[PDB]
Amino acid sequence: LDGPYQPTTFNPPVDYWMLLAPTAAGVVVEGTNNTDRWLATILVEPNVTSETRSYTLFGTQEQITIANASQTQWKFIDVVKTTQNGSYSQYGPLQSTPKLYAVMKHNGKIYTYNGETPNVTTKYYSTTNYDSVNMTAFCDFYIIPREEESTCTEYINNGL
Ligand SMILES: CO[C@]1(C(=O)O)C[C@H](O)[C@@H](NC(C)=O)[C@H]([C@H](O)[C@H](O)CO)O1
Numbered sequence: 001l002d003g004p005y006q007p008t009t010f011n012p013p014v015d016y017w018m019l020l021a022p023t024a025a026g027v028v029v030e031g032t033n034n035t036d037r038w039l040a041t042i043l044v045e046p047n048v049t050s051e052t053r054s055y056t057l058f059g060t061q062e063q064i065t066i067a068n069a070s071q072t073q074w075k076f077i078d079v080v081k082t083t084q085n086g087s088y089s090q091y092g093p094l095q096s097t098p099k100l101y102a103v104m105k106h107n108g109k110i111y112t113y114n115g116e117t118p119n120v121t122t123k124y125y126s127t128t129n130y131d132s133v134n135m136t137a138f139c140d141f142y143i144i145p146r147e148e149e150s151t152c153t154e155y156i157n158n159g160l
Pocket residue numbers: 080081082091092123124125126127
């Protein structure tokens with residue numbers, strides 16, 4: 001567990017999980033290869049009926065319709081597009097009590113956590129030039145090698 005690091009944009013090594021510890025609802029992390037993949041993770045508060053919100057994604061204001069069916073858990077949503085002018089689509093989510101998320105560049109993809117704490121799993125998004133994707137963290141974060149993924153999973157499920 002290397003960190004906490006303050007918000008910044010950098011090029012994380014492949015096969016490391018970037019464990020994010022946001023404190024507020026909103027954009028958590030975003031990264032793109034500038035060609036066929038844009039991913040931004042948004043943290044939505046517990047208990048939200050369908051509504052459109054404005055988020056700044058990659059420097060520009062975007063309207064996204066979100067919801068969170070859970071009465072008590074947070075919802076992390078990956079908002080992605082596959083071309084520069086394409087529409088954002090939602091995948092995931094991760095329903096969470098600890099408020100932690102993580103993202104990793106691995107084997108031609110970007111992986112993120114998914115499901116419902118305390119029994120999370122991971123999902124992925126194929127991404128060309130996956131190894132050079134820079135990630136912008138909007139909150140404090142830690143770095144954990146993939147070899148220690150069981151430790152990252154325990155933090156996502158139960159907190160630091
Ligand atoms: C093309 O197949 C895949 C991929 O990227 O390898 C399979 C992968 O399991 C799926 N992941 C999820 C969370 O649905 C992903 C997304 O649907 C797509 O990347 C969204 O842009 O599509």
